[PDB]
Every structure is written in C-alpha cells, then in structure tokens.
Specification:
2 copies of one chain form a homodimer. With 222 residues, chain A is an alpha/beta fold. Helix content of chain A is 25%, strand content 32%. Chain A has a 7-stranded mixed beta sheet with strand order 3-2-1-4-5-11-10, sandwiched between helices. In chain A, strands 6-7 form a two-stranded antiparallel sheet. Chain A starts with a helix and ends with a strand. Chains A and B meet through strand 7, helix 6 and strand 10 of A and strand 7, helix 6 and strand 10 of B. Strand 7 of chain A pairs antiparallel with strand 7 of chain B, so a sheet runs across the interface. The complex binds chloride ion (2 copies).
Chain lengths: 222, 213
C-alpha cells in the first residue's frame, strides 16, 4: 500500500509545475506531504483539505511553514474562491467522489488563468469489476486481472471488518471528456509502472500486468 | 463493430469543405466518399490490399478522390499538404505508432486534425482476445494481463497469422502529445445477438487530435 503510493509520487513529481510564489490547493492532503513539498519549493500560500482529523493533526505536526494551512472539510464542500489558485492537486482521492464533473466545475472556477489541475485516481480497470483483486485458481495463482461492468459508472463497495469502503467507478473517457468539456486542456495522461528503485522487488511484478492508477495533468483554458 | 466504429467516428469528423483529406487503411473507401460529398477539394485513400481497392474504386464516383496501393508505414512525405488524416481500426496493426505520428504531423497543415480508432489496450493486453469462461462456457469476465508489455500479439487460424501490436492508453496519448498534437477527444464507444456482452468491457479506443505548431 505504501509501496505503490511511492509509485504514484514518482510520476506525479514529474507533472508538477514550479511552485515559487504560487497559490496551491491540495484536495485530500492526508499527512500533508504535497503541502510541505509546495511550501519548501516556494509557494506563497497552500491550503490542505482532508476529512480525517487524525491525519490533519499529523499534517500540522509535520509542517513548519507559516505558508500552509489545513482545514477539516469534504472535497465536495470546498469553498468557491474564484481565480484564487495557480495549482490544484489531488493524490488518490477523486475516485471516492460521486461527481467528478462537480469537482471539475469548482476547480475551474477556483483556478486563475492558465491554472494547473493535476490528479491521480485508482484506474478504471482497477475499479471496473468491483472485486478489486486478481482472478485466482485453486492453488491461489493470480491468473489474470478480471474486468467487468466497465461502462457501469456506479458505486463500488468493498467490505472489511468494521469498515465500508465506497468508491465510484468511471471510465477513462469520463475522466478525459469531463476535463475537456469543463474547459481544461490535457497536458499528460500516465498509467504509472512501479518506480525504478523498486522495479526488481518480487511483489511489484504483478503491477506490470494491469494498471492500478491513472494520473492526469490539465491546464485551465478560457 | 465496423458500423459502430463509424457512428462514433462520424461525430469526431470536422467540416470537410475545401479540406485536403488522407485516409489510412481506406478499405472500400467509405470515408473518402463521405469527405468528397461534404465538400473536400482533394482526397487520397490508401490500402495494402488490392482486392479491397478494386472494390473501392468500383463504388466511388467523385473525381476529387484518388486511390493508391500502399502500406500505412510507407506513406509519402508531403509537408503541409493535408487538413485531415483519418484511420479506422488500423493503427494497432502497425509496429511504430511514433513513426506514424511523426509523418502525420509533417503531412498536416496548421490546426489540421488526426482522427483515428484502434482496438482498445484492454482488448489487446492479455493476447487471447476473448472472454474467460468456465468449463460450461459462461462468459465470466474479461481477462487483463501483461498490460505494460508493449509488443506483438499474434493470433493463429488455419492459413493465417494475425499480427497486432499492444500499446497502453498512455502510449497512444503521450506519443500524440510529444509529437506536437493537442488532444481534443478520447472516447471508448459502447454499441447502440452477441452485442449483449459488449457493455462489459471496452473494445475500441477513439482519439481526435489537432496539429499544434
Ligand atoms: Cl462525473
Ligand atoms: Cl510506438
């Protein structure tokens, strides 16, 4: 879980613009890694938004810069602040949001002219079937990755003891077309392979077989 | 599959009026006839097969449209000559999509479009190009494997090898981007018998792109 979170960051870093004197919004900031990074690369103002109080306490403990503020808030509830941001970021968060269209409308408004919108979601191929796991035989070999219901843009629920995880499946089309119809230009679309530091690692070998993540960089056009 | 490809591709097509068009893998020439009657000043359609190009010239009336017997990878370098380049279900049979992009960029005018369709990476990844079935032949789900393994996919029939090249969604999009195209539209079509199972996995990938200078 932390292994492929490093695989996300490696590709995401190469998408990032220069942060000097930029105003940054981080949707689903967690422990505030992107907010810290932005600050120490010269951002004038960073807002980190997350739902978990536990995570924001750890974020504020890890953040020294007076440039960064944190707020407990749902991503669907972000404030309308027209033209306030140079860049909006979101790492592994938007596949938990029901209307990606609403998020794009709000990000568009909140961004200045030629503002940046860079995000990563769990891949449509990862979420399509719903089981979010390998197809296995009797001995337990991962035979292949199952894909089903690809055009059923609906909730995907998974069950653990005491937890209910709720995600929303969307197609590659929907992510790209939603950005385009909302006035964004597509700069990059990447499906990350494992980071070159951990490409040898035995557990990372199944990650070449199906994509786990979708990363997209987009620019506001008026 | 073929008619379903057209329905969605038609929607991507620009105004053809006094546009110079190139159709790659033109088959029986459907796009070439379409463009000519929608006001194109000049159209060139190419195909490898002589049998299909015989039928193509047979069912074509307009003198705006010329045909040649030529493979896609051997298209002529003609700088700033075309307004629009089309390719329907053809580029997944070509090894270097980068090479096609380099030539199409050069052959297009400013703000000219490159519109194409291929078999979707999810259809081509595993290589078996078929459902996973149990012992009684229920179609269980569609199998994905070796997604980032970008190489040949061969299928065998009596008397023929079929050779396709598997590429990722990244590859198609990032290659267009690095060769100076702007992405205008990316669509994975659904259809409008055994079309019943087609809503379950994507079969085709359609991209519309514009030349940027
Ligand atoms: Cl949406
Ligand atoms: Cl290529």
């Amino acid at each position: 879980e932390g292994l492929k979170a490093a695989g996300e960051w490696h590709e995401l870093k190469k998408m990032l613009p220069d942060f000097n004197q930029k105003t940054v919004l981080d949707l689903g900031c967690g422990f505030g890694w992107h907010c810290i990074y932005a600050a120490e690369h010269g951002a004038k103002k960073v807002l980190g938004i997350d739902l978990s109080e536990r995570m924001l306490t750890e974020a504020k403990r890890k953040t020294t810069s007076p440039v960064v503020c944190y707020e407990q808030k749902a991503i669907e509830d972000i404030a309308i602040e027209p033209d306030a941001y140079n860049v909006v970021l979101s790492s592994l968060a938007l596949h938990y949001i029901a209307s990606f269209d609403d998020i794009c409308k709000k990000v568009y408004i909140n961004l200045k002219s030629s503002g940046s919108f860079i995000f990563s979601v769990e891949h449509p191929v990862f979420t399509a079937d719903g089981r979010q796991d390998w197809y296995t035989d009797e001995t337990g070999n991962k035979l292949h990755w199952p894909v089903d219901r690809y055009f059923n843009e609906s909730m995907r629920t998974s069950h653990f003891l005491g937890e209910d995880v709720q995600k929303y499946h969307r197609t590659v089309t929907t992510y790209i077309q939603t950005l385009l119809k909302n006035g964004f230009q597509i700069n990059s679309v990447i499906e990350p392979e494992p980071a070159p530091e951990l490409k040898d690692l035995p557990e990372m070998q199944d990650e070449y077989r199906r994509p786990m993540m979708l990363l997209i960089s987009a620019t506001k056009q008026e």
